[PDB]
Amino acid sequence: MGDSRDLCPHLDSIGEVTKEDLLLKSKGTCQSCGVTGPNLWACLQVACPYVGCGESFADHSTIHAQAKKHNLTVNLTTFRLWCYACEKEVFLEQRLAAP
Ligand SMILES: [Zn+2]
Ligand SMILES: [Zn+2]
Ligand SMILES: [Zn+2]
Numbered sequence: 001m002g003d004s005r006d007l008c009p010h011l012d013s014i015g016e017v018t019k020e021d022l023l024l025k026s027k028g029t030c031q032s033c034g035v036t037g038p039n040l041w042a043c044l045q046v047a048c049p050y051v052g053c054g055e056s057f058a059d060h061s062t063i064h065a066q067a068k069k070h071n072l073t074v075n076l077t078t079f080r081l082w083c084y085a086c087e088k089e090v091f092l093e094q095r096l097a098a099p
Contacts, residue, residue: 007093008083014072015046025051026076033057037076044074044081051076 002009025042029035030053039056043049048070052060054077061073061082071085081090 004093004095006091007095008072008081008086008088008090010071010083010085011081011090011093013046014044017044017046017049021049022074022076025049025074027051030057030060032060040076041073041082042076043068043070044072045070 002012022042022044026037026040028037029051030040031051033053035053035057039054040051041054041059041061042051043064045068048068050064052064052073054061054075062084065071065073065084071083073082073084074080075082079091082088083090
């Protein structure tokens with residue numbers, strides 16, 4: 001059972017992809033559009049390594065969450081998540097600290 005608000009429901013189903021994955025994803029460009037770093041949004045499912053765009057370009061965040069039904073993604077622009085399911089933005093459950 002999940003809890004707290006920052007912690008999203010599907011956030012526990014995505015497990016924890018490779019941290020560095022969030023680091024290369026933050027490389028600076030969409031992997032399918034090559035648009036830029038700011039306003040990027042890479043998928044964050046237990047098994048979906050790909051850095052999509054944010055409206056900034058075509059927002060793969062939508063068609064990608066729309067095609068793969070993946071709701072959670074992380075904006076390497078501000079460091080938060082986005083559940084196309086809970087349809088909102090969320091940061092690490094904060095339960096952790098000084099990682
Ligand atoms: Zn969710
Ligand atoms: Zn995905
Ligand atoms: Zn894209």
